[PDB]
């Protein structure tokens, strides 16, 4: 099972930083009882010790934390109005300009690996990524929901 609800998708304005993104994406997870109440702080410190993915044309980050902080599997998606720098996950000096954020709150290791594999395929689909930057929240929710449905 993976919980993905319509309010788990949102657009974010141009004046948010890395920490505001994490907290904004975590708050719906917090409010539905999917993660521990301080889940956001643990994502921030795990990220500082990085989930930025340099892919064309849209940079992606996958912030998350230890499965022990997840109560029920969920995903929270954020579309950034302006690119925001995430440090490369591989360990390259240049920061990744990110516009799409997949917050992963997965507690089950087999789901984590399946979702990371699905994300890897998705972010190499340039038509899909372009669509993410122009669809509305409901359309994004329906598109990703269908893809999470096909995953399981």
């Amino acid at each position: 099972g993976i919980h993905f609800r319509r309010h788990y998708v949102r657009h974010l304005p141009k004046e948010v930083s890395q920490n505001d993104i994490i907290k904004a994406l975590a708050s719906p997870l917090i409010n539905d009882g999917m993660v521990v109440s301080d889940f956001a702080d643990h994502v921030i410190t795990r990220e500082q010790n990085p989930t930025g993915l340099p892919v064309e044309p849209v940079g992606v980050a996958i912030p998350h934390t230890d499965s022990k902080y997840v109560r029920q599997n969920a995903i929270s998606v954020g579309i950034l109005a302006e690119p925001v720098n995430f440090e490369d996950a591989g360990g390259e000096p240049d920061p990744v300009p990110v516009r799409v954020v997949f917050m992963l709150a997965l507690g089950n290791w087999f789901d984590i690996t399946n979702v990371l594999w699905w994300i890897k395929a998705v972010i190499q689909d340039e038509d899909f990524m372009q669509q993410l930057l122009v669809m509305n929240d409901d359309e994004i929710y329906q598109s990703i929901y269908t893809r999470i449905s096909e995953l399981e």
Partner: antibody, heavy 131, light 109 residues
């Protein structure tokens, strides 16, 4: 600082049953995956089975020569891992090790479900199945 | 065996030696490597792409390509005389694990 103290090994008859125990200490056991591995006398290591954590519902996977006869369980309150062995056979004889089990998945090169690796081992407890 | 290892290899003191693990599941899954001496608990030597547990000597290194995993020991020391085991999935996408048959490393001591 990790210790994994297996016990319960001994002489048992073919067709009999035996329970092995492993007392774990020095790490967060509630969230750890745990594996049993055996070594028949004179042979190599053989993976027996592994029990997952709470996020996986404590699900268990077993090797083919053992599935349907062995049961792996755990009691997190006392940091114990168990191996219940039924309908034992001569070829089940050997040294049984518990192993703290880590999980690995490389984003760009990985394939589900990643890989498990065995980061801490006990010394093992010896099982001898004989008539 | 899903994972095939050489049975035995020799190396003079201070030489480099490589031992290998081969199987179809290695094209999809990294191998991990273990050292075991007579009468003693195995120890993990490394795992994943470029990961080595703290305390494991720098001279133990691993590589991988295609269906092949390799453990390379630089200047072999006397205490490296041991059995070496690789582990990975038994098949691609499997939840089970499996060990290779093990390699006896003799360090000409």
């Amino acid at each position: 600082e990790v210790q994994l103290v297996e016990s319960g090994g001994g002489l048992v008859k073919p067709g009999g049953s035996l329970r092995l125990s492993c007392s774990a200490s020095g790490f967060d056991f509630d969230n750890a995956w745990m594996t049993w591995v055996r070594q028949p006398p004179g042979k190599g290591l053989e993976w027996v089975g592994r029990i997952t954590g709470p996020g996986e519902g404590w699900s268990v996977d077993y090797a083919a020569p053992v599935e349907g006869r062995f049961t792996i369980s755990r009691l997190n309150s006392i940091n114990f891992l168990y191996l219940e062995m039924n309908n034992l056979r001569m070829e089940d004889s050997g040294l049984y090790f518990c192993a703290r089990t880590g999980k690995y998945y490389d984003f760009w090169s990985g394939y589900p479900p990643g890989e498990e690796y065995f980061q801490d081992w006990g010394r093992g407890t010896l099982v001898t199945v004989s008539s | 065996y899903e994972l095939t290892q050489e049975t035995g290899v020799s190396v003079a003191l201070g030489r480099t030696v490589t031992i290998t693990c081969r199987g179809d599941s290695l094209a999809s899954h990294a191998a991990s490597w273990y050292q075991k001496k007579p009468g003693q608990a195995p120890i993990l030597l490394f795992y994943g792409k470029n990961n080595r547990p703290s305390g494991v000597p720098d001279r133990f290194s691993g590589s991988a390509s295609g269906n092949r995993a390799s453990l390379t020991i630089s200047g072999a020391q006397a205490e490296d005389d041991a059995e070496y085991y690789c582990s990975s999935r038994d098949k691609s996408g499997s939840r089970l694990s499996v060990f290779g048959g093990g390699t006896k490393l003799t360090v000409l001591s």
